[PDB]
Amino acid sequence: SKICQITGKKAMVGNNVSHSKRRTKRVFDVNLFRKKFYWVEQDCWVVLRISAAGLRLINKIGLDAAIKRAAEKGFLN
Amino acid sequence: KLHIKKGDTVMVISGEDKGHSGRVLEVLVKEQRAIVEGLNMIKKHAKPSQGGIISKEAPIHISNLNVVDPKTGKATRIGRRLNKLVRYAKKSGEEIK
RNA sequence: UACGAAUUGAUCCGCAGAUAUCCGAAUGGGGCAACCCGUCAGGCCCCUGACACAUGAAUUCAUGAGCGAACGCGGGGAACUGAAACAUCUCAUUACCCGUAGGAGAAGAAAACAAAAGUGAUUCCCUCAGUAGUGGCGAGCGAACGGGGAUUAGCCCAAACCGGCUUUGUGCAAAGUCGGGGUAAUAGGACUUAGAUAUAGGAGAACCUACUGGAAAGUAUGGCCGAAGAGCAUGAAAGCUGCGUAUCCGACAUAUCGAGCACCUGAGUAGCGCGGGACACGAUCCUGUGUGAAUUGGCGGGGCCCAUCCCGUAAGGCUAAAUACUCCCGAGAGACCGAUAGUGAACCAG
RNA sequence: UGAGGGUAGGGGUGAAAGGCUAAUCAAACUUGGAGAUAGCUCGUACUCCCCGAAAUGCAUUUAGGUGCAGCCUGUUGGAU
RNA sequence: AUAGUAUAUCGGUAGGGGAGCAUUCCAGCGACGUAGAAGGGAAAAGGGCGACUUUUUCUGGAGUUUCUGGAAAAGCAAAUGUAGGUAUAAGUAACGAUAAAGGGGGCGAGAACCCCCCUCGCCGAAAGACCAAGGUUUCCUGAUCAACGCUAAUCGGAUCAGGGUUAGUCGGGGCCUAAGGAUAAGCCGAAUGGCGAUUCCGAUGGAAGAACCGGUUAAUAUUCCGGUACUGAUAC
RNA sequence: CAAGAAAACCCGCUAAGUGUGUUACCCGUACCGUAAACCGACACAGGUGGUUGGGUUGAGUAUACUAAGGCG
Ligand SMILES: [K+]
Ligand SMILES: [K+]
Ligand SMILES: [K+]
Ligand SMILES: [K+]
Ligand SMILES: [K+]
Ligand SMILES: [Mg+2]
Ligand SMILES: [Mg+2]
Ligand SMILES: [Mg+2]
Numbered sequence: 046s047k048i049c050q051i052t053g054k055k056a057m058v059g060n061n062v063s064h065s066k067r068r069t070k071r072v073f074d075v076n077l078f079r080k081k082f083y084w085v086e087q088d089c090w091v092v093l094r095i096s097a098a099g100l101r102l103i104n105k106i107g108l109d110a111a112i113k114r115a116a117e118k119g120f121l122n
Numbered sequence: 123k124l125h126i127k128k129g130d131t132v133m134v135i136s137g138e139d140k141g142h143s144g145r146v147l148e149v150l151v152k153e154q155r156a157i158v159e160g161l162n163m164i165k166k167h168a169k170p171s172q173g174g175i176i177s178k179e180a181p182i183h184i185s186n187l188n189v190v191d192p193k194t195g196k197a198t199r200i201g202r203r204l205n206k207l208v209r210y211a212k213k214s215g216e217e218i219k
Numbered sequence: 220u221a222c223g224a225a226u227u228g229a230u231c232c233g234c235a236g237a238u239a240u241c242c243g244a245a246u247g248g249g250g251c252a253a254c255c256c257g258u259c260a261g262g263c264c265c266c267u268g269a270c271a272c273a274u275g276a277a278u279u280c281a282u283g284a285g286c287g288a289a290c291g292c293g294g295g296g297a298a299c300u301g302a303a304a305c306a307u308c309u310c311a312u313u314a315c316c317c318g319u320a321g322g323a324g325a326a327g328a329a330a331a332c333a334a335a336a337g338u339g340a341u342u343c344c345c346u347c348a349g350u351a352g353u354g355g356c357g358a359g360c361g362a363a364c365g366g367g368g369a370u371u372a373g374c375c376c377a378a379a380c381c382g383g384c385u386u387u388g389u390g391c392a393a394a395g396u397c398g399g400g401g402u403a404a405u406a407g408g409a410c411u412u413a414g415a416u417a418u419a420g421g422a423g424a425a426c427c428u429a430c431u432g433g434a435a436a437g438u439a440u441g442g443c444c445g446a447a448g449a450g451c452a453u454g455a456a457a458g459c460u461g462c463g464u465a466u467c468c469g470a471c472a473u474a475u476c477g478a479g480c481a482c483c484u485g486a487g488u489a490g491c492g493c494g495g496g497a498c499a500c501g502a503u504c505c506u507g508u509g510u511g512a513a514u515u516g517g518c519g520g521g522g523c524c525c526a527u528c529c530c531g532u533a534a535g536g537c538u539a540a541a542u543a544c545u546c547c548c549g550a551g552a553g554a555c556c557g558a559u560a561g562u563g564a565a566c567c568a569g
Numbered sequence: 570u571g572a573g574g575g576u577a578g579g580g581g582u583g584a585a586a587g588g589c590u591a592a593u594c595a596a597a598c599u600u601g602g603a604g605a606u607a608g609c610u611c612g613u614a615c616u617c618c619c620c621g622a623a624a625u626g627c628a629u630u631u632a633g634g635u636g637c638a639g640c641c642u643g644u645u646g647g648a649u
Numbered sequence: 650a651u652a653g654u655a656u657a658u659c660g661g662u663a664g665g666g667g668a669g670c671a672u673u674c675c676a677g678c679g680a681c682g683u684a685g686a687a688g689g690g691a692a693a694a695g696g697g698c699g700a701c702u703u704u705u706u707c708u709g710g711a712g713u714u715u716c717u718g719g720a721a722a723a724g725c726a727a728a729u730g731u732a733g734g735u736a737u738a739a740g741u742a743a744c745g746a747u748a749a750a751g752g753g754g755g756c757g758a759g760a761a762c763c764c765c766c767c768u769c770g771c772c773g774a775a776a777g778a779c780c781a782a783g784g785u786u787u788c789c790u791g792a793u794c795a796a797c798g799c800u801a802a803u804c805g806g807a808u809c810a811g812g813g814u815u816a817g818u819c820g821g822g823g824c825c826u827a828a829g830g831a832u833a834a835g836c837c838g839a840a841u842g843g844c845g846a847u848u849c850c851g852a853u854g855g856a857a858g859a860a861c862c863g864g865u866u867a868a869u870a871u872u873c874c875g876g877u878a879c880u881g882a883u884a885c
Numbered sequence: 886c887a888a889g890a891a892a893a894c895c896c897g898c899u900a901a902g903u904g905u906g907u908u909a910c911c912c913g914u915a916c917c918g919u920a921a922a923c924c925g926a927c928a929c930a931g932g933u934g935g936u937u938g939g940g941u942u943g944a945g946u947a948u949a950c951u952a953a954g955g956c957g
């Protein structure tokens with residue numbers, strides 16, 4: 046599943062619009078990558094599939110709170 | 123429930139054999155017809171199996187048959203009363219059979 | 220045709236039980252559906268009985284899977300066609316494909332409308348109105364406010380602060396977890412039923428003579444019943460022949476019905492740039508990508524924007540009714556068809 | 570040459586002929602959108618009575634179409 | 650049409666206007682019918698005109714209808730129009746390889762064709778014999794000749810009924826794997842899902858378990874019987 | 886020279902731990918099958934994989950004539 050595990054972000058459907066206003070279907074994809082993280086509280090490593098927006102949340106409230114927030118809303122499963 | 127049954131004595135009230143009484147021989151419930159003894163004879167043509175024409179009673183539709191009164195000899199309508207239920211003749215009121 | 224059952228109550232009807240091979244989600248493993256091959260525990264004797272043995276998500280146990288009308292909500296999403304050509308636009312947020320509920324679903328309790336005059340949740344109907352708008356300002360598309368109705372209903376958290384317990388750092392402090400406190404817009408808060416119904420049943424009035432006729436229920440007399448003159452059947456057209464109808468009566472089962480104080484009031488959120496989408500619409504709402512506040516003297520809206528004034532309290536949640544539909548069950552009807560009609564199918568019918 | 574597999578529709582496959590893909594191929598078949606659209610051709614059913622044309626002008630991606638005028642007819646009011 | 654009988658007018662395509670008939674059903678007031686309704690055949694008569702109507706008689710054997718108003722699935726001659734039936738071409742084409750028939754008996758209502766016999770002719774690396782695929786009772790026997798058989802038929806691969814297929818070794822299957830398929834752990838992806846082992850499935854191939862000759866039935870035969878062999882388990 | 890499947894059966898290795906008798910389950914087995922029975926709407930001059938296929942003549946499984954058997 047191509048879903049961010051911290052934010053839940055997935056691809057959205059839109060249009061290409063030309064100068065003559067021809068509209069053709071397109072996909073807006075997520076800036077999604079796999080990254081390894083050191084988890085200070087648990088003294089371990091985890092690998093997450095997150096967006097660049099999810100990394101911003103990790104680098105603001107910390108890893109541990111981000112995973113707790115992600116598990117409440119149902120993003121990590 | 124039917125207003126007649128086997129062994130009953132009934133009088134024909136319509137048809138060519140009207141005014142004639144007789145005993146009930148067999149009741150065909152699904153077709154609502156009955157055989158009355160001695161009435162509505164037919165001439166059946168049978169092959170040997172010695173052959174010949176033979177006589178038999180043909181069934182009469184049961185709505186043309188009424189149970190004869192116990193006391194008087196005329197046909198009457200019937201009813202059922204608890205005095206299980208039992209049939210009785212509407213003309214005289216006595217129990218039937 | 221043949222043999223039997225039954226007034227010691229057969230057949231038949233209602234209710235509850237017993238049995239219920241093989242395939243099929245098919246689930247012990249395989250497989251070309253209705254077949255083949257096992258492990259394990261028992262009992263009979265090369266075989267044969269009778270158990271268990273899939274997977275996935277929770278804690279051995281519990282759960283799910285599959286099928287099936289329409290109505291709901293989500294994810295994707297055409298073209299012919301119209302524009303008397305055609306690309307914006309239209310057809311249409313249709314057809315169609317996929318996922319997934321319930322007896323309905325969705326919505327729903329104002330960060331709302333309005334315009335110094337007021338109404339206060341949502342839904343649905345009649346108007347407003349083919350109006351204001353929108354639009355290669357073409358073809359087209361198309362509101363809301365206000366008024367009249369149906370139905371009516373309102374609530375719960377988080378936080379301040381207090382207590383306990385666990386954990387962590389070092390008695391203190393932080394986090395987590397339960398208990399108490401508390402729930403705003405005129406701002407508020409903290410502290411200082413058991414009967415009825417349903418699925419079998421019981422009773423239920425009253426007609427004679429003559430003619431025609433194969434056969435009267437017809438016709439002509441003379442009677443009678445009516446809370447019953449609806450109907451169907453009976454050798455022709457029956458209130459009084461039969462089954463019924465009006466009315467009344469019934470269930471062993473099972474099913475259903477104070478002052479002060481400035482402590483708190485939801486954050487990668489509101490807002491913004493770039494690219495798209497939905498709104499009637501080629502300020503408002505949603506977001507792929509990059510960023511990013513304040514705290515009641517706050518914040519949001521009133522169709523660029525600023526000032527003033529008015530209205531309201533986002534980033535937590537729950538809620539009946541008035542609305543949508545018919546695979547189906549019961550009761551009915553039709554200035555609807557009557558066998559090349561009416562369903563493809565009155566029979567034997569996918 | 571036999572058996573069993575595999576490639577599926579703007580796709581396949583082709584010692585290349587636009588060949589072949591179930592007697593169908595310059596884009597298979599089936600069902601649906603769907604009664605697509607057709608300024609084109611053909612067809613349009615009982616009776617009697619009164620009146621009764623046009624095949625011109627202008628414009629048109631128009632010329633075998635259409636809009637307006639001209640010419641017919643109903644009702645109504647005026648005389649011309 | 651104008652005036653209220655007089656004057657004028659009455660050929661018509663596209664087209665405009667007026668007035669009527671029939672059909673199905675409904676409301677109302679009413680009628681007809683087994684002493685014969687509807688429908689079908691024949692005949693006669695009517696209508697300013699017509700669409701149509703009425704009567705009589707035969708058939709038929711149970712429904713039908715006037716008037717006033719109301720509502721429509723409300724009228725066919727043609728669409729290379731549809732269904733069903735029946736014609737014409739016409740007693741015509743044709744009866745499906747030019748391998749071929751003749752005679753005597755038989756059963757029988759019936760024989761060019763069926764059965765038996767004698768002669769003739771054709772195939773014979775096949776037009777003979779044994780399997781596989783596919784078919785699924787067509788196999789044998791009795792009864793039958795309606796339909797089927799391109800003629801007739803006493804005959805048949807036809808109709809009905811009865812009967813008939815026998816395995817320790819044959820062919821399969823049980824075992825093994827190929828192409829390919831389904832998967833496990835994993836990977837990818839709006840959904841539906843797409844991939845992915847040394848795992849499993851999957852013969853057209855490999856198996857270390859082994860049979861051949863003869864004879865008997867109307868119809869089976871390494872299967873039944875005879876003779877002579879072989880291969881696993883199991884108990885002493 | 887173009888360089889000619891796989892796995893199992895059957896034999897090793899360690900790790901971990903002859904005689905007699907009885908008996909041999911399942912499915913197929915008819916018939917057609919270079920055809921009147923299969924694929925072609927037909928009792929259709931077409932198509933349909935493998936094995937066998939006597940004698941004389943011949944190089945021959947060609948050709949001609951014949952047996953068994955099958956046919957007109
Ligand atoms: K199974
Ligand atoms: K709490
Ligand atoms: K195509
Ligand atoms: K009628
Ligand atoms: K015979
Ligand atoms: Mg167009
Ligand atoms: Mg459900
Ligand atoms: Mg509701």
Ligand SMILES: [Mg+2]
Nearest residue numbers: 502521522524
């Ligand atoms: Mg303003």
Ligand SMILES: [Mg+2]
Nearest residue numbers: 558560561564
């Ligand atoms: Mg029909």
Ligand SMILES: [Mg+2]
Nearest residue numbers: 586587588595
């Ligand atoms: Mg060319």
Ligand SMILES: [Mg+2]
Nearest residue numbers: 589591592593
């Ligand atoms: Mg072809």
Ligand SMILES: [Mg+2]
Nearest residue numbers: 578579595596
């Ligand atoms: Mg095309």
Ligand SMILES: [Mg+2]
Nearest residue numbers: 299602603605
């Ligand atoms: Mg359409």
Ligand SMILES: [Mg+2]
Nearest residue numbers: 603604605606
């Ligand atoms: Mg069409």
Ligand SMILES: [Mg+2]
Nearest residue numbers: 620621660661
């Ligand atoms: Mg004239």
Ligand SMILES: [Mg+2]
Nearest residue numbers: 608632633634
């Ligand atoms: Mg033209």
Ligand SMILES: [Mg+2]
Nearest residue numbers: 635636637638
């Ligand atoms: Mg004109």
Ligand SMILES: [Mg+2]
Nearest residue numbers: 658659660661
């Ligand atoms: Mg004249």
Ligand SMILES: [Mg+2]
Nearest residue numbers: 619659660661
């Ligand atoms: Mg005229």
Ligand SMILES: [Mg+2]
Nearest residue numbers: 727728729730
């Ligand atoms: Mg022709």
Ligand SMILES: [Mg+2]
Nearest residue numbers: 738739741742
């Ligand atoms: Mg001729």
Ligand SMILES: [Mg+2]
Nearest residue numbers: 739741742743
């Ligand atoms: Mg000739």
Ligand SMILES: [Mg+2]
Nearest residue numbers: 742743744745
């Ligand atoms: Mg011919």
